[PDB]
């Protein structure tokens, strides 16, 4: 069983630790979801009529 | 924008308040004045008719 060959373990561990925790996490961080456009048709600070 | 534009014309109209007050002033003045004129006219007419009546 090749899986049991403990000679070549680090050459599997290292690049996985690199691509799962650094590269892929970054390629995610670049993917952002902006909040939806919410044109507010009610916003008017008009003081009381002067009076 | 237009709501502020509306508020512009409205305050622009504010001057009505004062002249109406003015209107009542000049009115009530002539009233009391003319009332006085007819008070004096009536009272002298009363004595005049009283004597010519008796």
From Swiss-Prot, chain A:
Q: Which residues of the full protein are shown?
A: 1 to 51 of 68
- Gene source species: Homo sapiens (Human)
The record's subcellular location field reads: Mitochondrion membrane
Protein's recorded name: ATP synthase F(0) complex subunit 8
**Intrachain disulfide bonds:** none
Topology relative to the membrane: Single-pass membrane protein
**Recorded GO MF terms:** proton transmembrane transporter activity
Q: Where the protein is mainly located, per its record?
A: mitochondrion
Summarizing the function annotation, the protein's role is: Subunit 8, of the mitochondrial membrane ATP synthase complex (F(1)F(0) ATP synthase or Complex V) that produces ATP from ADP in the presence of a proton gradient across the membrane which is generated by electron transport complexes of the respiratory chain. ATP synthase complex consist of a soluble F(1) head domain - the catalytic core - and a membrane F(1) domain - the membrane proton channel. These two domains are linked by a central stalk rotating inside the F(1) region and a stationary peripheral stalk.
* Residues that span the membrane, as ranges: 8-21
Magnesium listed as a keyword: no
Keywords noted in UniProt = Acetylation, ATP synthesis, Cardiomyopathy, CF(0), Disease variant, Hydrogen ion transport, Ion transport, Membrane, Mitochondrion, Primary mitochondrial disease, Transmembrane, Transmembrane helix, Transport
**Complex formation:** Component of the ATP synthase complex composed at least of ATP5F1A/subunit alpha, ATP5F1B/subunit beta, ATP5MC1/subunit c (homooctomer), MT-ATP6/subunit a, MT-ATP8/subunit 8, ATP5ME/subunit e, ATP5MF/subunit f, ATP5MG/subunit g, ATP5MK/subunit k, ATP5MJ/subunit j, ATP5F1C/subunit gamma, ATP5F1D/subunit delta, ATP5F1E/subunit epsilon, ATP5PF/subunit F6, ATP5PB/subunit b, ATP5PD/subunit d, ATP5PO/subunit OSCP.
Statement: the UniProt record of this protein carries the keyword Iron-sulfur: no
Hey, which family's this protein in?
A: Belongs to the ATPase protein 8 family.
- In the record, what disease is this protein associated with? Mitochondrial complex V deficiency, mitochondrial 2: A mitochondrial disorder with heterogeneous clinical manifestations including neuropathy, ataxia, hypertrophic cardiomyopathy. Hypertrophic cardiomyopathy can present with negligible to extreme hypertrophy, minimal to extensive fibrosis and myocyte disarray, absent to severe left ventricular outflow tract obstruction, and distinct septal contours/morphologies with extremely varying clinical course. Cardiomyopathy, infantile hypertrophic: An infantile form of hypertrophic cardiomyopathy, a heart disorder characterized by ventricular hypertrophy, which is usually asymmetric and often involves the interventricular septum. The symptoms include dyspnea, syncope, collapse, palpitations, and chest pain. They can be readily provoked by exercise. The disorder has inter- and intrafamilial variability ranging from benign to malignant forms with high risk of cardiac failure and sudden cardiac death.
Gene expressing this chain:
MT-ATP8
Write down any Gene Ontology CC term: proton-transporting ATP synthase complex
Q: Which domain of life is it from?
A: Eukaryota
Mind listing the GO biological process terms from this record? Answer: proton motive force-driven ATP synthesis; proton motive force-driven mitochondrial ATP synthesis
From Swiss-Prot, chain B:
GO terms, molecular function: proton transmembrane transporter activity
Subcellular localization(s) per the UniProt record: Mitochondrion; Mitochondrion inner membrane
Query: What range of the full-length protein does this chain span?
Result: 150 to 203 of 256
Q: What is this protein's function per UniProt?
A: Subunit b, of the mitochondrial membrane ATP synthase complex (F(1)F(0) ATP synthase or Complex V) that produces ATP from ADP in the presence of a proton gradient across the membrane which is generated by electron transport complexes of the respiratory chain. ATP synthase complex consist of a soluble F(1) head domain - the catalytic core - and a membrane F(1) domain - the membrane proton channel. These two domains are linked by a central stalk rotating inside the F(1) region and a stationary peripheral stalk.
Q: Which residues form the signal peptide?
A: none
Concerning its family, UniProt says: Belongs to the eukaryotic ATPase B chain family.
Q: How does it assemble?
A: Component of the ATP synthase complex composed at least of ATP5F1A/subunit alpha, ATP5F1B/subunit beta, ATP5MC1/subunit c (homooctomer), MT-ATP6/subunit a, MT-ATP8/subunit 8, ATP5ME/subunit e, ATP5MF/subunit f, ATP5MG/subunit g, ATP5MK/subunit k, ATP5MJ/subunit j, ATP5F1C/subunit gamma, ATP5F1D/subunit delta, ATP5F1E/subunit epsilon, ATP5PF/subunit F6, ATP5PB/subunit b, ATP5PD/subunit d, ATP5PO/subunit OSCP.
Q: Report what the protein is called.
A: ATP synthase peripheral stalk subunit b, mitochondrial
Which keywords, in A-to-Z order, does the entry hold? Acetylation, CF(0), Hydrogen ion transport, Ion transport, Membrane, Mitochondrion, Mitochondrion inner membrane, Transit peptide, Transport
An example Gene Ontology cellular component term from the record? proton-transporting ATP synthase complex
Q: Which Gene Ontology terms describe the biological processes this protein takes part in? A: proton motive force-driven ATP synthesis; proton motive force-driven mitochondrial ATP synthesis; substantia nigra development
Q: What is its main location?
A: mitochondrion
Q: Does the keyword Acetylation apply?
A: yes
Question: What domain of life does the UniProt record list for this protein's source?
Answer: Eukaryota
Post-translational modification N6-acetyllysine, affected residues: 5, 13
Presence of the UniProt keyword Ion transport in the record: yes
Q: Which gene encodes it?
A: ATP5PB
């Amino acid at each position: 069983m090749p899986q049991l060959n403990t000679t070549v373990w680090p050459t599997m561990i290292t690049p996985m630790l690199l691509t799962l925790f650094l590269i892929t996490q970054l390629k995610m961080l670049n993917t952002n979801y902006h909040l939806p456009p919410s044109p507010k048709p009610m916003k008017m600070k008009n003081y009381n009529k002067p009076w | 924008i237009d709501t502020e534009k509306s508020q512009q014309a409205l305050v622009q109209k504010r001057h009505y308040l004062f002249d109406v007050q003015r209107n009542n002033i000049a009115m009530a003045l002539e009233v009391t004045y003319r009332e006085r004129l007819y008070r004096v006219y009536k009272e002298v007419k009363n004595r005049l008719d009283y004597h010519i009546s008796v």
